[PDB]
Design an enzyme around this catalytic site. Sequence first.
Site, PDB file in Angstrom:
ATOM      1  N   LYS A 255     -12.586  11.221 -86.284  1.00 15.01           N
ATOM      2  CA  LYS A 255     -12.449  11.656 -84.896  1.00 15.01           C
ATOM      3  C   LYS A 255     -11.628  10.632 -84.129  1.00 15.01           C
ATOM      4  O   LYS A 255     -12.004   9.458 -84.058  1.00 15.01           O
ATOM      5  CB  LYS A 255     -13.806  11.831 -84.211  1.00 15.01           C
ATOM      6  CG  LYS A 255     -13.664  12.221 -82.755  1.00 15.01           C
ATOM      7  CD  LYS A 255     -14.917  12.898 -82.207  1.00 15.01           C
ATOM      8  CE  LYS A 255     -15.946  11.882 -81.804  1.00 15.01           C
ATOM      9  NZ  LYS A 255     -16.863  12.454 -80.747  1.00 15.01           N
TER      10      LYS A 255
ATOM     11  N   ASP B 275     -23.348  14.996 -81.716  1.00 16.14           N
ATOM     12  CA  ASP B 275     -23.088  15.058 -80.281  1.00 16.14           C
ATOM     13  C   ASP B 275     -24.376  14.977 -79.465  1.00 16.14           C
ATOM     14  O   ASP B 275     -24.470  15.539 -78.377  1.00 16.14           O
ATOM     15  CB  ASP B 275     -22.273  16.299 -79.917  1.00 16.14           C
ATOM     16  CG  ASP B 275     -20.830  16.180 -80.346  1.00 16.14           C
ATOM     17  OD1 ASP B 275     -20.099  17.176 -80.226  1.00 16.14           O
ATOM     18  OD2 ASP B 275     -20.420  15.098 -80.817  1.00 16.14           O
TER      19      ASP B 275
HETATM   20  N1  LIG Z   1     -15.926  18.429 -90.277  1.00 16.76           N
HETATM   21  C1  LIG Z   1     -16.665  17.491 -89.681  1.00 16.76           C
HETATM   22  N2  LIG Z   1     -17.457  16.709 -90.455  1.00 16.76           N
HETATM   23  C2  LIG Z   1     -18.190  15.790 -89.826  1.00 16.76           C
HETATM   24  C3  LIG Z   1     -18.147  15.613 -88.456  1.00 16.76           C
HETATM   25  C4  LIG Z   1     -17.308  16.452 -87.721  1.00 16.76           C
HETATM   26  C5  LIG Z   1     -17.220  16.381 -86.260  1.00 16.76           C
HETATM   27  C6  LIG Z   1     -17.239  15.270 -85.445  1.00 16.76           C
HETATM   28  C7  LIG Z   1     -17.295  13.829 -85.758  1.00 16.76           C
HETATM   29  C8  LIG Z   1     -18.192  12.969 -85.115  1.00 16.76           C
HETATM   30  C9  LIG Z   1     -18.216  11.615 -85.414  1.00 16.76           C
HETATM   31  C10 LIG Z   1     -17.343  11.140 -86.356  1.00 16.76           C
HETATM   32  F1  LIG Z   1     -17.364   9.811 -86.663  1.00 16.76           F
HETATM   33  C11 LIG Z   1     -16.438  11.937 -87.002  1.00 16.76           C
HETATM   34  C12 LIG Z   1     -16.422  13.288 -86.702  1.00 16.76           C
HETATM   35  N3  LIG Z   1     -17.192  15.682 -84.118  1.00 16.76           N
HETATM   36  C13 LIG Z   1     -17.124  16.999 -84.134  1.00 16.76           C
HETATM   37  N4  LIG Z   1     -17.132  17.484 -85.398  1.00 16.76           N
HETATM   38  C14 LIG Z   1     -17.109  18.952 -85.547  1.00 16.76           C
HETATM   39  C15 LIG Z   1     -15.729  19.547 -85.751  1.00 16.76           C
HETATM   40  C16 LIG Z   1     -15.836  21.061 -85.835  1.00 16.76           C
HETATM   41  N5  LIG Z   1     -17.152  21.526 -85.378  1.00 16.76           N
HETATM   42  C17 LIG Z   1     -18.223  21.044 -86.262  1.00 16.76           C
HETATM   43  C18 LIG Z   1     -18.141  19.541 -86.487  1.00 16.76           C
HETATM   44  N6  LIG Z   1     -16.573  17.391 -88.333  1.00 16.76           N
END
Ligand SMILES: Nc1nccc(-c2c(-c3ccc(F)cc3)ncn2C2CCNCC2)n1
EC number: 2.7.11.24
Length: 344
Positions: free
Chosen positions: A49, A164
């Site tokens: 992210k 979240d």
């Molecule tokens: N595919 C996936 N796998 C794990 C997490 C996420 C993720 C994160 C996120 C949070 C912290 C982090 F360090 C990295 C990613 N934030 C939103 N999403 C969403 C992206 C699409 N909707 C469902 C999950 N997405």
Amino acid sequence: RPTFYRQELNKTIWEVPERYQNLSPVGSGAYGSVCAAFDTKTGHRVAVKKLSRPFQSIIHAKRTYRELRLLKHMKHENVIGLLDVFTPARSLEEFNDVYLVTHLMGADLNNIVKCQKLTDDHVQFLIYQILRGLKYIHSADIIHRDLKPSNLAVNEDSELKILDFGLVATRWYRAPEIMLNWMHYNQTVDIWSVGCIMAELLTGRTLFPGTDHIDQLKLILRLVGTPGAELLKKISSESARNYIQSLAQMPKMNFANVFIGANPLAVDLLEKMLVLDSDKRITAAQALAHAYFAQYHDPDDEPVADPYDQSFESRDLLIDEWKSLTYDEVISFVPPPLDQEEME
Ligand SMILES: Nc1nccc(-c2c(-c3ccc(F)cc3)ncn2C2CCNCC2)n1
Ligand SMILES: N=C(N)NC[C@]12C[C@H]3C[C@H](C[C@H](C3)C1)C2
Ligand SMILES: [Ca+2]
Ligand SMILES: [Ca+2]
Ligand SMILES: [Ca+2]
Ligand SMILES: [Ca+2]
Ligand SMILES: [Cl-]
């Protein structure tokens, strides 16, 4: 020092260590956007992210710090935690981008219940995992407050993590005390959401699909019955209290006649979650002991969290102070072992 490379993803430049390859967008996250990637160090799939404008204002700056502190603390198999956190910045003076890394979870709960009639055993496993993660975050005095299927990440084997937490949206899963703004509430706001999620997994239909705040309240009251004067105690707005008091009195429905054909243990658990009185609502730890989860429950594998110091929340600091504190947390991060579990 790792070599970074640049790639345009979601119409902006990402700058990431060579370690992370084959970035591909998988949607927005809280205050950022997310790419799937391949970790060449471990051969694991990860989600990265990139926070959007993390230090634009004290609001962004503090929420950047808040999220990094929270994710650094979360160490539970049903809660999103951190495998890595990085920045292309070589110094605090250059520091303007923050990337958070976690294990890749390919789906959310809406992908699971949409085109599949889930079995009761499978619903049990999904809800069990939510509650196990909630027991953990609640034990650290962290509440989600907006728990919903789109905030439950699921992988290909229905393993689930809450995301979240502690931070136009659908309100269909929000606790009534939140949606309509009670003066005080507790951790069981999240249990209301679990009840709504569980009901939908069992029936394939959204439980309370209201078109506005008033329509959603009326749908809720049709199921659980009109509240007593005691619960008006929590509502500040007189016009809102007057309105709710003005409603024709509705009896609580027998959930056994609403969820026709469900496991009676599932109906009983729903009755304990979907109660307006938040002080009467079952807790996450209590729900894990409910007979509905008997085949999964394991008290040795339902841990609580280490104490979490949230004293920063009451403080107003300057942007550059939040930025420096965040930089400190990036630099001090200790990646966890790849294997952190042992056979029971
Ligand atoms: N595919 C996936 N796998 C794990 C997490 C996420 C993720 C994160 C996120 C949070 C912290 C982090 F360090 C990295 C990613 N934030 C939103 N999403 C969403 C992206 C699409 N909707 C469902 C999950 N997405
Ligand atoms: N239309 C829906 N999917 N939900 C609305 C409901 C359906 C039944 C259970 C509760 C209370 C009352 C009867 C209205 C929620
Ligand atoms: Ca076990
Ligand atoms: Ca192991
Ligand atoms: Ca595993
Ligand atoms: Ca054991
Ligand atoms: Cl801490």
